[PDB]
């Protein structure tokens, strides 16, 4: 996989070029936003169980057929596999945030996930609902004004949002 710095380097190498000053400036700015990026990852990680559990609870009350006998989340084995899927997506989303690039998601999420689910009979559209619930809670927690130096993280929040959206698109 690649992070935002490596992505620029690989592109330049293919052309046999040294990076330009504007490319260097762009990388300096990403370094400046560094502390903010770490706060987001730390906040999401520190509240991971809550984010997953509440999203799961909300999904199951909205779609009760998922847990009735014969439903895809019925039996503890399937429920645990379901909770694990949500934790995995959240984990990969946090990796994408620290890397500043979606590639980390691609080489996994693109491991035919929508094909895998179809073959197993996992309702991809329901997983997408779970990801959307995780997205809203993760952004609220990460963007909480309390107990942090106040400043603007709007650019980061949009970036975070795009990673959840990318995951939700891939599962269906």
């Amino acid at each position: 996989m690649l992070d935002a710095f490596a992505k620029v380097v690989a592109q330049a190498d293919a052309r046999g070029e040294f990076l330009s000053n504007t490319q260097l400036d762009a990388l300096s700015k990403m370094v400046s936003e560094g502390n903010k990026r770490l706060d987001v990852v730390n906040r999401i990680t520190s509240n991971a169980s809550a984010i997953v559990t509440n999203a799961a609870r909300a999904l199951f009350s909205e779609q009760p057929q998922l847990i009735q006998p014969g439903g895809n989340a019925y039996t503890n084995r399937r429920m645990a596999a379901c909770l694990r899927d949500m934790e995995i997506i959240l984990r990969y989303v946090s990796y994408a945030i620290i890397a500043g690039d979606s590639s980390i998601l691609d080489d996994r999420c693109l491991n035919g996930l929508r094909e895998t689910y179809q073959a197993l009979g996992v309702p991809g559209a329901s997983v997408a609902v779970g990801i959307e619930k995780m997205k809203d809670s993760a952004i609220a927690i990460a963007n909480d004004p309390s107990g942090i130096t106040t400043g603007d993280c709007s650019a980061l929040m949009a970036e975070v949002g795009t990673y959840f959206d990318r995951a939700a698109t891939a599962v269906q």
Partner: protein, 162 residues
Amino acid sequence: MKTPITEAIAAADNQGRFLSNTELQAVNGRYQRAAASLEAARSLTSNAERLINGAAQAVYSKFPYTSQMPGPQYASSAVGKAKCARDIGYYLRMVTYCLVVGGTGPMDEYLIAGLEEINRTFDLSPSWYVEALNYIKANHGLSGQAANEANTYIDYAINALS
């Protein structure tokens, strides 16, 4: 490609867990060092042509036979001199890439892997490149931690050739 950030991710992912404070501190470490790395990368890039030409000349001066002996492996022909300066430029470019990502990944992947086989196959002497690298180290004009960053990667290449 390997970078301090992708390695931190790889470590977490290998253990099936979220990133821990150990990995966040490692990324913080790369961010703090980046100011010196990027100053070095900017300086080396703007002075590239001068360092490459001067480095090639330092090799020819130290090893006179390289510009006199006939043969494709030598810089005794126009094509030879052009390939020599090209090679030196590749090493300088890889150094700037390492400075940018904060690790040896670009050099490891694009240059070091296969280095021994190429040098033996085409009859290129490792010591020719060590002299070119020593020239760059002595002439980049950097100071402080930026000189430290540049030299650490230059030395990493020297060690691979020794």
